[PDB]
């Protein structure tokens, strides 16, 4: 769906914010931009492309 990937994007930015991503201005700004774009997306290919790039922020750390 679209609602499922949008809700998963919200949960992903919540667990990025709990890992203190926002102590990095450059990293936090990129995550906010991807999350905002996913929440305003209309088709599922762009939203999943930005979901790839947002999940790569979480998998760049140690978990």
């Amino acid at each position: 769906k679209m609602s499922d990937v949008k809700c998963t994007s919200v949960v992903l930015l919540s667990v990025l914010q709990q890992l203190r991503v926002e102590s990095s201005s450059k990293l936090w700004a990129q995550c906010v931009q991807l999350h905002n774009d996913i929440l305003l997306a209309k088709d599922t290919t762009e939203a999943f492309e930005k979901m790839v790039s947002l999940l790569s922020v979480l998998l760049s750390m140690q978990g």
């Binding site: 769906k1 679209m2 609602s3 499922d4 949008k6 809700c7 919200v10 949960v11 930015l13 919540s14 914010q17 926002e22 201005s25 936090w28 700004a29 906010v32 931009q33 999350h35 905002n36 929440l39 305003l40």
Partner: protein, 898 residues
Amino acid sequence: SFLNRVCGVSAARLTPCVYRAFDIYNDKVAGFAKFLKTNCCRFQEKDEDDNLIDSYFVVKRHTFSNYQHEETIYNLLKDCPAVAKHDFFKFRIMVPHISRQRLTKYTMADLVYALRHFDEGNCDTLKEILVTYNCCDDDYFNKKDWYDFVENPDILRVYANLGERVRQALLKTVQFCDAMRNAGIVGVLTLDNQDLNGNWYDFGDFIQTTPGSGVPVVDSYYSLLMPILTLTRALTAESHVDTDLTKPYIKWDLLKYDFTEERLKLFDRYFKYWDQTYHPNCVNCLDDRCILHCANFNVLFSTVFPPTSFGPLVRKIFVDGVPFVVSTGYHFRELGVVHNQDVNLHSSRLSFKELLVYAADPAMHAASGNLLLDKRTTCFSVAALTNNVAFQTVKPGNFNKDFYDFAVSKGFFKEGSSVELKHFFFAQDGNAAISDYDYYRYNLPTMCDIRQLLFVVEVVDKYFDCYDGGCINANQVIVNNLDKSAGFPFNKWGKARLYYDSMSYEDQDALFAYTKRNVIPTITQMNLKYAISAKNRARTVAGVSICSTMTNRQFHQKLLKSIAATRGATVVIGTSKFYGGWHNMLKTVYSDVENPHLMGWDYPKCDRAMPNMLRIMASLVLARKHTTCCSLSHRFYRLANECAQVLSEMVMCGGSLYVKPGGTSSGDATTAYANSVFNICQAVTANVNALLSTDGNKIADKYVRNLQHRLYECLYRNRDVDTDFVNEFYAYLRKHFSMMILSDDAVVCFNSTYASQGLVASIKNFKSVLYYQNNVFMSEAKCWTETDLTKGPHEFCSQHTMLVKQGDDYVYLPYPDPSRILGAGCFVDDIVKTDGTLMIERFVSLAIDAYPLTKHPNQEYADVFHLYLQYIRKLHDELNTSRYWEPEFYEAMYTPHT
């Protein structure tokens, strides 16, 4: 052989050549409208090449008596260089002709009408004026939204290229008025008799008196011209050395704040024959209409002066032998210099009320802070109060997976269906607060039509005559939520509850009596808001200081509680939509309107772009309930405190102090009521501009033609209040333009044949009024029209309307966007995730909102209430008609028996 006769008079090679705008006042018709031109001949002049130039030779024919009359008045005024050269000659077709020489294509009335009746796609004359006088190239218009102040702020530079021609027109009007007074000529100056080079040419309506005793009438000229003076920034040259654009700016003294003689010199240079008394300091004004009149001149002259001259005026004060910096006054852009009266230069102790006043004002904060140069914004930065800058962020929302899995279990969120997820908690990065603060660049210094505003304020005051108000004591003040914010310095030590518990009733009474003689400038704290939205923009709260909100409650609460308790009025603040209140509101709007349609509009950037003159007007309307309890000086100092506290306040935004240019503050409780006054003001001036710009010769109704003829003379010809005509125009507006106002949201029920004939306002008039009086472009895509009144208004306060059967009669019910209800259910704030009872109250509120969806023809909309009721039943099982787990509880909220 007429063509070689006209150039036989004046040696210049000529080429021969419609709807023009006129300011008309006759015994037959009165208005500022576009009329037809039939009796004239225009010949154009050419350059050294065979290319046409802006010189025109207007030759018209007359009888013999007015030919002798024009000649005998032109021979007395010719020596003025502000007069266009006139050639008088007889041509045998013997008919006397009058040939004016080297006029422009357009007059000043064409410029003033084209900017006061703006229409996208019907603006050829404004484009021609902008191209002819080199403000912009022809290709500039191709760009989309070239006219829009918000989406293209380069149009301010384009319009400001026109300001030097307007200043020369003002100078030539003063020269022509001096020439008329020195020759003993009495006449009315109108904008259609002056071209865009500044020359005056029509002398038919002038009469002759003894020389030295001429009186030119210039109320209509100056007052119709006034919005163009700040739109084109016509007094830009007055900040340069010797009023020359080429010369460098005037280096004013930084210590200088008075500028009273400079304001008087500017008034004498540009408005010498304006006959009303101008007070540069509005403390010396006689009433509220005098304050409005003299504050309109101050907003034009304050654009000349350095921006560091405004704000609080500070002075070194010794408390118990210790040097202290305190504010002893204020230099307003609108009100001039205001001094405080209870200024003690030497003090022994510091009482609690004076300590509160000394902690509230920005003098001790900004005098001990560092200098700040913030290149992120264009607003005036005052001082950084800390060594660091705060970058606060907004977290995303807390996803409610239980409700979402329950909703997908019940068959929701299928693709291609009506109800989807559209409302989210948009997260914000570190640059969100200052980029939201940068939207105060949409507030521009705006001069109003003062003769029009002084009539519109008397009509708007008729909408507020049913309420009662006045000052109350501190023991009569009811505080709704004691857990509101306390403004900048006071939020470090508690909420608003601590300052109401600490201060005595006598302390609050003395603080309120201190504000009737002194100005206490305060600081507003702007923070980002953690809220759900459908758009990407950041939301902000504003915390006004406890001093301001305490004395404003004491000044305004009786009137605000009386407005919020009145049913059946125009302002519907405080009327609940429950228990049949939506139906009563809508039956009040369709009062007796005879050919009714419905109509709504929006105000783009209303919190930011609202002019300071209209906010001062709204405050004076709200302060008119104080004729018994307040003197004139007390009411002026209350106005000055409101201007220093919620209008031109200093804003703490991220550890730093800035200057707010104006606009409303979203944390002040008076903001909704001031927005309603502003809304009624814009609607009344849209109706005045619709009625005065209609050709009265083609108005068939004699009552309406007589009404516009009295409307023009009540604006521009009389300076007293015709109290009998204000009642008549208010009754006319109540009959044909019934309104429902709730804080800048509005529906009207208007007579549609009157709107097609141009007798009441339509969407076009609201667009024009917002363009010249608000510096915004209202698009028609956010405005709506509803021709069938069984369907309700398309949207009022984010609520849709349905006509359903309830009992034995058809009742209007309100319903929201179902996507909004599901998004509020699925995404939840942090406090609601902690306690499970708060989730039950949140879902009961959402099921109350979503109950009228069950009566919708769409079954998918109707299932939202059943989903919320089943989830409420589940939440109750994991934990009469007074039981919220049954549909009777939600049916009883929309039935008229309260």
